[PDB]
Write a protein that binds this ligand. Sequence first.
Ligand code: HEM
Ligand code: HEM
Ligand SMILES: O[C@@H](Cn1c2ccccc2c2ccncc21)C1CCCCC1
Ligand SMILES: O[C@@H](Cn1c2ccccc2c2ccncc21)C1CCCCC1
Lengths: 368, 371
Amino acid sequence: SKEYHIDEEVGFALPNPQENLPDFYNDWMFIAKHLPDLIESGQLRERVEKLNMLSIDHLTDHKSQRLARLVLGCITMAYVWGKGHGDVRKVLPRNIAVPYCQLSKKLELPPILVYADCVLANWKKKDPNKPLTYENMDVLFSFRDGDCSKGFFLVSLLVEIAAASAIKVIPTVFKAMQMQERDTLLKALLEIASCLEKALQVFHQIHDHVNPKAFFSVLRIYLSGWKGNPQLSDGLVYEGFWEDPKEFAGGSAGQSSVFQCFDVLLGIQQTAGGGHAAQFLQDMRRYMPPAHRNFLCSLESNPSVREFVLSKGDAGLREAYDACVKALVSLRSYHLQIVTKYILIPAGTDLMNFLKTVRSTTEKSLLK
Amino acid sequence: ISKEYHIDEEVGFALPNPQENLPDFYNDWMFIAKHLPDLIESGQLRERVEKLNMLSIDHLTDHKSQRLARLVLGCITMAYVWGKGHGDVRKVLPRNIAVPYCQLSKKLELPPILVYADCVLANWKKKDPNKPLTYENMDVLFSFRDGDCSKGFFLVSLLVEIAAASAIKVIPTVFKAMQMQERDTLLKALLEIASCLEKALQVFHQIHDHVNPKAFFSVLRIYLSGWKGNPQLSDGLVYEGFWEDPKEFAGGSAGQSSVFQCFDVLLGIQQTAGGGHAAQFLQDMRRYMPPAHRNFLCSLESNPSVREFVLSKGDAGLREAYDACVKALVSLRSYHLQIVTKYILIPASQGGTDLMNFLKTVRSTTEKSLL
Ligand code: HEM
Ligand code: HEM
Ligand SMILES: O[C@@H](Cn1c2ccccc2c2ccncc21)C1CCCCC1
Ligand SMILES: O[C@@H](Cn1c2ccccc2c2ccncc21)C1CCCCC1
């Protein structure tokens, strides 16, 4: 569909994002395009404080509003965390905080860098006529030299794209259930598992493009927010826009709509139950684009694919459903091996118990 | 016309014509629920719950019977857990009532605890079927204690839920007028909605006639509170025979009412958006609405914003019509805010003050929505 902003080729990713803002915002674009140098030289916070308050009125369309959210978002994290060694700022200056909050209010997103900014909207094609492959793609913004932010973002983006192939089968699933078309539903579930199995092979590229100590000690710092953070115990002051400081969670892949979408489709009660994992994945929906929030909730309004398969006494239909659940377990299991390489060894123990709980919930959803 | 969603033309989100009696197979359940005041005060409610046999849910054939069974099992559960309402708490719900309550709640996609849709939307009847829906012609189906003001509290909420129903049927007219670009139809629709919300404010005044501040704070409030962030059941309540761990579920609230969230969504009042505790609370309370009412709120959020439509037109008449609805929402919460001060703030001085900071936040969000 169209009002959910789900593309045929890139799915939840923003199709063909905008790389440049109008000349009116050149003072923004220069800072965001040179974050590794302005941070390393100890001049980023000065350049930010010298900016004049630019109006968001010249951001006329959707794509340019998403780019400015990415620009202002990357500068905010660069201003709050600085060099990423402890010298923080608990007040975001109004010349960049007021337009950030105004733009975030308009796009119904929190004023902090989220997954839909630094992954779904932070990419470009090198050559337009060539396909969406890692060698033909690039990110628009980074934080530090050697933060491996290109590999981390683009590999997440590429797994998102690989999962988009399964997203377009979803309407066939619900149509087959309503029309009681058993053979069509089986073929569709097998196709959804096939696409999720291709996405697992895409995931393997993470070792080639992401370095362990680079992600743990650099990129992770600039992606963390100010909710439950001892460094900003009461949040961030959004100067000129809010009286009190506000708390917002740093970016996450719980913000990725892809995995939440198949949890709902297959009846994997991730957001139910009551655990911290349930509440966290539920809260991270507030950090998705509004169109993608509505898509997840619209899947939850449809009849359960799980209860349909359980009620038929159909072996071939339970295996096709199990192939979809199995593909989700395979992804989170391989992803769990990635987190031990990139987080546990460089170190955190709560992340494992969170991921193991999400994976545990998925594996217990199998029928055999 | 709205589909279902389960929204009535006359009573809106309330259950139309609730069932008063379960089949004979469940006579052991109905006897306890119908005699809570005597069984609680005499201290023999918990015994008669424990010597119940584990009845099956298969004999609740239709929707209205399952909603009544959710109402009776919900009232017995609060009575069992809170007892006489003075501190002696049970942390274990016996299996012969825990597993049919959880089985039935699993089927209706609701959590195993009394919610607004139980004790308000499904907890009423007409005294005379032919006479209109007024306070004098209505009555609740269940109460906790004698003098808990549960009749006046449940029916006054129910009456303004009906008063809002007149504005819910105009919602399809609002979105069709935007899609088909009918400016005059939309303006008339927004004015019709604002009028109904102003009709509902007058119904709200009956709260002083039929509710007592001391009876609500010290009696009815105890039986409606739940086991989520509660120092009396810090880990939750164990539903014996169904879950091995204790589970936390929030007490009944009017944040579970769909009418006020429904108009926040329609007017683009970003209540659930933002990071505040009030935004987190109102989103969490949707998990406590009936599934058809959850899906209706979701369906509204998927439609284009009525607010951005009115802002983009440069139309003074359209803005005044949109402002009349926001003004009507501010007037309701403001009057409701003065009710809480008489019924919660003053009895507390012989949650707490967080109830006031919560309601002032949602009112401020509604008030700042003006143009
Ligand atoms: C070096 C690579 C990666 C690291 C270090 C990493 C780390 C983490 C951590 C620590 C979490 C849980 C805490 C939190 O989300 O805040 C998480 C969650 C998640 N990650 Fe990753 N991740 C990596 C790659 C990926 C990729 C490429 C994807 C592609 C879709 C992905 C998908 C997810 C999802 C869906 C979640 C939410 C939890 C779940 O649904 O199981 N991760 N990641
Ligand atoms: C004694 C009379 C009343 C009292 C003491 C009372 C108290 C409260 C309190 C404390 C809250 C927010 C706290 C919470 O639920 O956890 C609340 C919310 C609410 N009440 Fe009431 N209430 C009363 C009557 C009514 C009536 C008649 C209605 C009409 C439906 C109503 C509608 C609501 C709604 C919709 C909310 C959600 C909060 C919001 O407006 O955003 N209340 N009430
Ligand atoms: O890496 C993030 C989690 N996370 C993201 C955060 C922001 C933007 C994207 C992601 C992300 C993307 C894919 N997998 C995990 C992800 C971080 C979460 C807090 C603990 C360290 C790891
Ligand atoms: O007043 C109730 C909230 N509440 C309900 C709870 C259960 C069922 C209905 C209601 C309700 C209905 C209207 N207003 C407030 C309401 C309670 C809120 C939490 C603090 C103690 C007082």
